[PDB]
Amino acid sequence: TKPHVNVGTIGHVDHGKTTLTAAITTVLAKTYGGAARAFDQIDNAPEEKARGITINTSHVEYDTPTRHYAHVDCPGHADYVKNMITGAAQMDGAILVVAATDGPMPQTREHILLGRQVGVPYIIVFLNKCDMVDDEELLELVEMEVRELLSQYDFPGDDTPIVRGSALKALEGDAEWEAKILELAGFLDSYIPEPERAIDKPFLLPIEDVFSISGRGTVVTGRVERGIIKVGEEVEIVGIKETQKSTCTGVEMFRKLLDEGRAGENVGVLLRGIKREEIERGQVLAKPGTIKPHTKFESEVYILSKDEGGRHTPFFKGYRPQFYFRTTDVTGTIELPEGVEMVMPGDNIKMVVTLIHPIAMDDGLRFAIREGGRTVGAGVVAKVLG
Amino acid sequence: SNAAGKDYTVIANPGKVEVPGKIEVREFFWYGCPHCFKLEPHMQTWLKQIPSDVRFVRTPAAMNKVWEQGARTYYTSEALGVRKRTHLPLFHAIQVNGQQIFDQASAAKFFTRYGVPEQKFNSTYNSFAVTAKVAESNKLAQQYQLTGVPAVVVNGKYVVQGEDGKVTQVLNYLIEKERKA
Ligand SMILES: Nc1nc2c(ncn2[C@@H]2O[C@H](COP(=O)(O)OP(=O)(O)O)[C@@H](O)[C@H]2O)c(=O)[nH]1
Ligand SMILES: [Mg+2]
Incomplete structure (x- = not known):
């Protein structure tokens, strides 16, 4: 050990x-x-x-x-x-x-x-x-x-x-x-x-899907990325829409309802007071006050070469790709370093990104850049800005 | 011995090879199969000395839901570019150790040992490209009328079965036979 x-x-x-x-x-x-x-x-x-x-x-x-x-x-x-x-x-x-x-x-x-x-x-x-x-x-x-x-x-x-x-x-x-x-x-x-072991970190679950349940209630599914969620604990639902707070009333695994879910497990989380329309794929569940939604960030990015199956041509300051964070795509615009007019396949650069809606993120979060689901770039959040 | 209908069989509805210009050698297998596993070290020593005019490809069996899981795992490892690292230890894990790597979740867990994140394994496992491979696998198997594994198919017109060095001896005979017209 x-x-x-x-x-x-x-x-x-x-x-x-x-x-x-x-x-x-x-x-x-x-x-x-x-x-x-x-x-x-x-x-x-x-x-x-x-x-x-x-x-x-x-x-x-x-x-x-x-x-x-x-x-x-x-x-x-x-x-x-x-x-x-x-x-x-x-x-x-x-x-x-x-x-x-x-x-x-x-x-x-x-x-x-x-x-x-x-x-x-x-x-x-x-x-x-x-x-x-x-x-x-x-x-x-x-x-x-x-x-x-x-x-x-x-x-x-x-x-x-x-x-x-x-x-x-x-x-x-x-x-x-x-x-x-x-x-x-x-x-x-x-x-x-x-x-730090994953199980010891504050609870975080990237939402993969959303289902209706118990007539009017809601269950969200995903893999517990870190920590532990227990029934009765509050969670924040972070990113994309206004941050919401809810209470975990059950952790669904297979065809039963459990008192807790741990890092690594694929679970459904029953949430009190949450209508299906109020929650979506790409949001995260998290221990309250431990992750914030941002739209703007500094990042370091590698752009795949043609040989790696990436773009064939350079992109310019007006480029507007899909940024893939955990479980969903989000459109954003970019700013290049001054003096830099275009970015070649195979290049790496510092990129300032502004997403169309906020995503839950901290420094160090990795992301993909994609066109039609095809990966053309890979990046890491260097500094969150707003 | 190398006699048609005895040591190898001639396919009734021969197919055209995937890559023109090379003599195709295509192995049908399942990670769960002990006879495939017995064949493997023989295939491995045969691969060490592949002729420049033959192309070797594995086509994992997928005619049923059980074997399809192995099949998806394989095509996934190839999709991600790690098959050369994972193929033999995966095979070893299942056949020598008793590891139950027979579904998407335990395969994903296994592949974390090789740097592959579970999310990327999962998106790949059920991607259209892997699903296309599975379909192609099933297409050939029905055309070549394979009823099980292992089977090695040469230039889409000969089937060789067995689990020992006799297999690779008959393969070399067939490969040389093709080399004439
Ligand atoms: N004299 C001396 N030569 C060294 C030392 N470490 C490495 N070298 C030599 O410097 C060259 C570069 O070494 P290498 O480890 O391959 O450099 P790398 O590009 O950083 O991986 C090689 O010829 C080494 O043998 C050292 O401590 N002393
Ligand atoms: Mg070196």
């Missing part, structure tokens, strides 16, 4: 992300024992290319005595951008690799910025290639540059753990450098808080 933490490496090309990844797994395996390996033989049958975002990712797993880590690394900057905006696993923490020999480089900055935008909660720094530097004053200068860069994007640069190491020497089994990998793993253990 070792807590599960998702992490990944970020930083500029050639700074050592792949070597560090291999070094962490090797050292931790030889020190604490390797992670449990599951069945995962790969099908030799040829696989035709399918529509959708293509993301090159490597995954490994490694354990410390108290934690289990799932670790993602990518070959190139384009892959990091996609994975951070819309990659299969949201990082609980990132390891920023910076080569002491270069100091912070353009993709060092870009990855930290992206990190702030998509909500990476924590960043730990591995100052790599220290085997090439005999010059403590230079190491201190590079660390100061890194801390100042982090703080520029509101990461706590002064409080950030920074490990001085060599991924390559550690991978090659040099004991002195292996110790720096253990130090890094120590900071993954102590600096990244155990992530």
